[PDB]
Amino acid sequence: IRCIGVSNRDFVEGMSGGTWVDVVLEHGGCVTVMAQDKPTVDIELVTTTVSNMAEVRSYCYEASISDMASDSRCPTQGEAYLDKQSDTQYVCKRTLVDRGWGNGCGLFGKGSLVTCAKFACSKKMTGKSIQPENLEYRIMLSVHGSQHSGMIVNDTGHETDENRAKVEITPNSPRAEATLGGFGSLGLDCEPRTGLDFSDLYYLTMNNKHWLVHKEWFHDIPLPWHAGADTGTPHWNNKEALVEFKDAHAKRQTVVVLGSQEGAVHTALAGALEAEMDGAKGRLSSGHLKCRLKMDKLRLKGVSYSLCTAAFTFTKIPAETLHGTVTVEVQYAGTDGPCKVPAQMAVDMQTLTPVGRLITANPVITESTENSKMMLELDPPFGDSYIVIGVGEKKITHHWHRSGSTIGKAFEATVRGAKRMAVLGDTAWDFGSVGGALNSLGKGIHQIFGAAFKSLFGGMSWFSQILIGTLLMWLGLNTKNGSISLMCLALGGVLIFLSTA
Amino acid sequence: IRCIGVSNRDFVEGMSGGTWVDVVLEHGGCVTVMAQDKPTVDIELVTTTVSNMAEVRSYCYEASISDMASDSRCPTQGEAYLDKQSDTQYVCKRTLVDRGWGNGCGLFGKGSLVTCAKFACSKKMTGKSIQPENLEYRIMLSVHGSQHSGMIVNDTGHETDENRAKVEITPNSPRAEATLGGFGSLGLDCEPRTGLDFSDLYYLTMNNKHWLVHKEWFHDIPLPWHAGADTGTPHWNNKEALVEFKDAHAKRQTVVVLGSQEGAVHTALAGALEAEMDGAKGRLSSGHLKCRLKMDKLRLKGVSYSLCTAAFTFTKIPAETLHGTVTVEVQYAGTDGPCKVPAQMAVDMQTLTPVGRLITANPVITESTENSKMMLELDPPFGDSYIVIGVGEKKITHHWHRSGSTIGKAFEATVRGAKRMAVLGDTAWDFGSVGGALNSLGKGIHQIFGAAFKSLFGGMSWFSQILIGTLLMWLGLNTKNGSISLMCLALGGVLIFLSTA
Amino acid sequence: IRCIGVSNRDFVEGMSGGTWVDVVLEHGGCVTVMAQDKPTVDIELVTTTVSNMAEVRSYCYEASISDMASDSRCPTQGEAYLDKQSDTQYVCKRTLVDRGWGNGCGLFGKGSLVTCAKFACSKKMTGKSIQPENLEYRIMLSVHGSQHSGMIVNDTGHETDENRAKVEITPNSPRAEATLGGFGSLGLDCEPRTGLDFSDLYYLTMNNKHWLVHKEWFHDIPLPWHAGADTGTPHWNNKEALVEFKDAHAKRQTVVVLGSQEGAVHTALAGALEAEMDGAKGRLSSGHLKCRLKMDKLRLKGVSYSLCTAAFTFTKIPAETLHGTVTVEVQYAGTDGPCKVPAQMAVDMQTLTPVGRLITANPVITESTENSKMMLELDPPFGDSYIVIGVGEKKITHHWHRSGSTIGKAFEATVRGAKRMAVLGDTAWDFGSVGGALNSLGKGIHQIFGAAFKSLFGGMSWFSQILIGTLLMWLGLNTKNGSISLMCLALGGVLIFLSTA
Amino acid sequence: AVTLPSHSTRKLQTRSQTWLESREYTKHLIRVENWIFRNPGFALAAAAIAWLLGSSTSQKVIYLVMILLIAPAYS
Amino acid sequence: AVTLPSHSTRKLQTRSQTWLESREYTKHLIRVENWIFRNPGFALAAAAIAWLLGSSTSQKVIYLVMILLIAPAYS
Amino acid sequence: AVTLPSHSTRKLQTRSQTWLESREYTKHLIRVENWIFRNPGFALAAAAIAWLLGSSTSQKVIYLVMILLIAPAYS
Ligand SMILES: *[C@@H]1O[C@H](CO)[C@@H](O[C@@H]2O[C@H](CO)[C@@H](O)[C@H](O)[C@H]2NC(C)=O)[C@H](O)[C@H]1NC(C)=O
Numbered sequence A, B, C: 001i002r003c004i005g006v007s008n009r010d011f012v013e014g015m016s017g018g019t020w021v022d023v024v025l026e027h028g029g030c031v032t033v034m035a036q037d038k039p040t041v042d043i044e045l046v047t048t049t050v051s052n053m054a055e056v057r058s059y060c061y062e063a064s065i066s067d068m069a070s071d072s073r074c075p076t077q078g079e080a081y082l083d084k085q086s087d088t089q090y091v092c093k094r095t096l097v098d099r100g101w102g103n104g105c106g107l108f109g110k111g112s113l114v115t116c117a118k119f120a121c122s123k124k125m126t127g128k129s130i131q132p133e134n135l136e137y138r139i140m141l142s143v144h145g146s147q148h149s150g151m152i153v154n155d156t157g158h159e160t161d162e163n164r165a166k167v168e169i170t171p172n173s174p175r176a177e178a179t180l181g182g183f184g185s186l187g188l189d190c191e192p193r194t195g196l197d198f199s200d201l202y203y204l205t206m207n208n209k210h211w212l213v214h215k216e217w218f219h220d221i222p223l224p225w226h227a228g229a230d231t232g233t234p235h236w237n238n239k240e241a242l243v244e245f246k247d248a249h250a251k252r253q254t255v256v257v258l259g260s261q262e263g264a265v266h267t268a269l270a271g272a273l274e275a276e277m278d279g280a281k282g283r284l285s286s287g288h289l290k291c292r293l294k295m296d297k298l299r300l301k302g303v304s305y306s307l308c309t310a311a312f313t314f315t316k317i318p319a320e321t322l323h324g325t326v327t328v329e330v331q332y333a334g335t336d337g338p339c340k341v342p343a344q345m346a347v348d349m350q351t352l353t354p355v356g357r358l359i360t361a362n363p364v365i366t367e368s369t370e371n372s373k374m375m376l377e378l379d380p381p382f383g384d385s386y387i388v389i390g391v392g393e394k395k396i397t398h399h400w401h402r403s404g405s406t407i408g409k410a411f412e413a414t415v416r417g418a419k420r421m422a423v424l425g426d427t428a429w430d431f432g433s434v435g436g437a438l439n440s441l442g443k444g445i446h447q448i449f450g451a452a453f454k455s456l457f458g459g460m461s462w463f464s465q466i467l468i469g470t471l472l473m474w475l476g477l478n479t480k481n482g483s484i485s486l487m488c489l490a491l492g493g494v495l496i497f498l499s500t501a
Numbered sequence D, E, F: 001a002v003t004l005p006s007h008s009t010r011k012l013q014t015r016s017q018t019w020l021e022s023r024e025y026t027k028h029l030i031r032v033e034n035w036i037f038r039n040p041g042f043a044l045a046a047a048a049i050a051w052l053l054g055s056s057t058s059q060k061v062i063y064l065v066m067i068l069l070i071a072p073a074y075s
């Protein structure tokens, strides 16, 4: 639930460290925590809201020019200043121009023109600052057990039903204890200020759209920029460079508007997150967090029941999921008080031995309605196997088959792992529990070597990264044998970051 | 006249063969023809009009999107086509998207979305074709003599007053003979189809502005382009690429407008002439022509007169011009029939010997008004020389001084010459008269070596040309031999074309 | 019964692993289970029905063209678009064509044509998807004993009359217990989702015929394809490539229909099973299943009877069957309650001794009718032997002779075995009972080595397989180095798969 | 155009005879045995391509088979 | 002016697809594949710059790639 | 997308000043002088690419210019 079809999957084996399992969350994906001490809990990030933003600079997408005038003082005579040079708000450019004879005055060598034009912006684009304070998060979480598979995605109740809970996390409170009624409460601790890498991202608005921008982009761009602190009337900086006052060899100096740029900023922004809003608070969607999940108090609600009688008949027939798990709907007609539901993935028929992990924890259909549904899911072994439900002679079974095995399941897990290293780095070591040396130094040797790679290289991507990447791999084949050790590796370092896709 | 202050000056003094002098004309400058026995004639190009243009392709500066809708058939189907895919006029993109269970249907692996949006352009930019036929030119020409210096620039009477004439030249008529009444008629032959290098220039219109564009630019640009031949309703090609339909890891596929590009096309156009137009027709201004001027019939409008009595005064005092010529206004109060005016540039006093060229031809004040003006101009020497006017004891003189000499006047003429080679090449050999071998092979060895340089190099300008330029000059210093001869020269070839400025 | 003449025979000796005997079934053949604990049971597959199919893509077998029109804009010009380019549904191709002079417009240079034609399909071919769910099977099974040999093939008592039960097997139920009244019930477990190798087979319909197609065939074919999800009106993809718009060299661009392709798809399909269907459902015939037959409860109904008196006659005389078994009809005129029938295959008579297996289990004629028939069959030894019936001085015997022996019967069994490896692979290890190591690793070492051979090789068959096959066998004779040990074997690997026939 | 790749590439394999079993045996061969009878030539010069390629016995024969075989083909 | 530097330099990296993912793959390549089709020249003389620079095989090739690559661009 | 190729490639040449003369002088340079100030890095490792490429003085310098120059290029 809040899982299955999402297709970006992370399973995090239990943690014998006392519910100290630490997990990363990405707005794309979700991680399911399976712990024998617990019912399997499904965590997913949803929306990271930002509120109480402030304005920083701004720009002019579309220039507009008003009144063009000029004067010239003839040869010997500075550039006669128009009145329009005293009001600011007017572009002015003083150039040298021939006024010969019948241009009205002797000395046919070179005079001076001063042309000026009122400059009034049209539309605008206003950056906004995002600070780690007044930053929020929203984590919805749910628990597999027994529940109408039709409820897999819903929000009506976020504060009720089986156990779903909507957890908020904001700076001044890294922790929230989510109480899922009857399952106890999942201790949850998250570092809001760390993960998302803010303070480097200005929040940016073109006309009725939004983005995010690394600073040292939005701080340096060549357009007219309002000072941003006062909205009364624009007193611009710049004000050239969206207006080109040019002239050929004659008596004229002309001036051009440039026809906004609004198409440029778009085509300029690349690799920039697009963020929607709804008034004063903007909801990004790109997930990052480091959450240490405390599994301490979780009370299985499916213990101390009988086994639900015979009357189990699948619905929607089973299906395969993504990483290979299987889901099942079962409608137990037999009605009693909430009754535990036997399910076993069996590698045979006669004597049914448990084969393969059953991860719903303990499915328990809670209704008196005499007709109920429970969606339990389980991952059977690679070879052909049966899914079995029930204990009585009326039990019903289904045959199901898994594709790959062993080395098969390793590669697919070895790719996604490296995918994390690609998208995260650093914190990507935070799945593993406790303090393990290999995990301790894992973030250790990575953060140092990483930042250096986040400075030396780190110029650009796509055809930029691959080139400087590919050329290094050449040095490995050639050159001595002392440097071709590091270089021929560094290529892979780059190429992999280009192979994310 | 139509000269002096223009400051881009070309003197042509080679009236050898039966008035065969050949001259080039550039909308910036003007060439004055001064030939012993013939009044000095001032030629200048003005405006090259193009008419009867036709439309070729067009583009969409500003995209606009209308109705976004989508459907999805769930895993295992094809992409369910909306009705909107049958009308064209709609962008559509079929992508793969996870629909897991409570997305409504089993098989949580990957389905398909088809999103579509009506696409309606806003504004437009429409190229136009220019053909050598229906191409015109306008050459205004005037003759020094002595008309009223206040008339140096006027048009009110380009066919009556003074000796001005407005000559048209269009393909189906390379020749125009301008009858300047009483001076005879200047035989004029020009190659319209050759000089301006058309057929490679599409005429281009953004909103209320104009340009010129080398083909292989305007033919290849990535925007939606109307087919251009029918204005009834747009049936676009392209369509995409001004509209980016993008999605995020979810059930959604979004679509964006891109906020015109109108700022791009501007900032894209560089090294494209500006242009203006007065309706169906339009007036470029960049001059190029090869005109072989036939000086055959020109009558001296100042022979067989007396010498105007004594009564000369300066009005506005003399002045220096540009390349070093001097102009003079003189008001002869002498009441006589139209009469010849003595002027001599004499270095010294007593025995006034003629010193330096007098180029007005023969100044002849034509009025009976008893008070008249004549503007005659002349180029004296460097050393403090006198300008003298009159023959009687009442004659009045002025002292005037020239800056440089000899090697001085050569360099300034050696730069302008190379300037022509710069933005001219080829035809820049066409000033010299007749058939001279050195001039014959001059265009000869140049056109061949030139075109090769117009293909091998010729990529770009500014920081592009200089680099590939500067690196070659390195090859000239280093290396061994052979190329060290050609390369070290080729640098200068490039650097000079970069040194035009 | 449901056996004998079928001529594709599999005998499975079993009654060890508590009836754990596992058997494969092929729509061509049938396997008979002989177990001392049981009456000999004859299993055969019949028809595998597929239901609840869905449509995927489709194609156009026969193109039809309607209205051809064109226009041309002369010389360079955005190919003048016809209105017919805005409706889709029209092919259009823009080409370059000379229009000289009296073609109506100057510059008889190269212009552009745009020709368009309405495109409306005729007939169609619509793929359909087959999913492992809603997949069925039909297994008819019967038991030798002695029923009337004329009943060997019938379907009237499918639900009644001695051994003859029709078992269904569909996913959501791998098991069915077939109750043969009085013999108990044969426990039967089958993996429906595994054997037939579905999900790779689209179900395909030309006009009034059917097929099966491996995907990556039907997914990639070059014809116009409807999107398949909506039947309202075709909005095609493709729509070229069944229509060739081609031109000569003058003023014309012509267009051709191509005269369906319906003959191509046929001649294209090769190695695709034939198929037939009745309505929404359709019945393939190619068998594959892995059925683990539970022989647990089978009660011989021929125990605790007397021996039927003396009065046996042959009707139709004995005969030889295929793999060498013999069938006998016997009409016991003995009027008695249902009674046991003695039969022994005797070697001579020096001492009436049982010789060779009697496989009908215990023939018991059940009637009071005083004239009855029982068809019992048995496999006598290689040498000459007698078939004997009855224990009374009225007993009647027949002499019968078998062809080969020992090494004879091994080769014929060694070929059919390898035939299974050829047609199945993998599961072909599933005849043997229980868990035997040699059988355990048998599928083990095969599945790995097999799939690799199902990827590296596996391009094609017939003259494709043999060639790449035969060339390898050359490398075995030659070469030098050890790999020769693998290659010279790999040839046999290929040649055998070509030797299936 | 031509297209319609031959389904023989992925050949559904089971006991029941496939679509065309009979024609599928000679259909790859018969094409060659015609195209040669039309043009003897590509064979006549084939050896020249052969003897100048690989230059050893069998290793130079496999060409003269590979060439005359790729000759009647369009790939 | 132009400049308007490309935000791709610092590319915000997370799971959600960035602003233009699709066009960002070919946008650096497509520019070159045009500018050459317009001017074959800078390639034709490139080798001359190459063969006179670095004068060894690959070490002399990396130029002929670096040159034709620095050729179509304001850099 | 971007592409929108720069008309500077074929630059109409005549006496009248072209469209943008002023910005066209620094527009190719200013882009680089920014992108370095943002990332010192590609310079720092550039020499490594240099010293391992062409391995002679100037011939090894032209790389360290060509690299840091193609560094701010989209092609
Ligand atoms: C989300 O929760 C709501 C209940 O809070 C579910 O909606 C109910 O559906 C039943 C089915 O007929 C109605 O009788 C109730 O009246 C509904 N409650 C209302 C008014 O919202 C909903 O089904 C849940 N989500 C899903 C998809 O199951």
Ligand SMILES: *[C@@H]1O[C@H](CO)[C@@H](O[C@@H]2O[C@H](CO)[C@@H](O)[C@H](O)[C@H]2NC(C)=O)[C@H](O)[C@H]1NC(C)=O
Pocket (backbone or CB within 6 Å): B150, B151, B153, B154, B155, B156, B157, B161
């Ligand atoms: C332009 O030239 C015209 C001649 O066609 C001048 O017009 C005459 O000017 C004189 C003195 O200024 C007046 O007395 C006449 O009445 C005018 N007659 C005409 C032609 O209208 C004119 O002054 C000149 N001015 C310019 C633009 O230089």
Ligand SMILES: *[C@@H]1O[C@H](CO)[C@@H](O[C@@H]2O[C@H](CO)[C@@H](O)[C@H](O)[C@H]2NC(C)=O)[C@H](O)[C@H]1NC(C)=O
Pocket (backbone or CB within 6 Å): C150, C151, C153, C154, C155, C156, C157
């Ligand atoms: C199939 O089995 C049935 C079962 O007996 C046979 O049908 C009998 O046929 C006789 C002769 O026509 C009838 O008199 C009986 O009434 C039928 N029994 C019933 C009710 O089915 C039939 O002969 C068999 N068919 C064959 C040849 O396979």
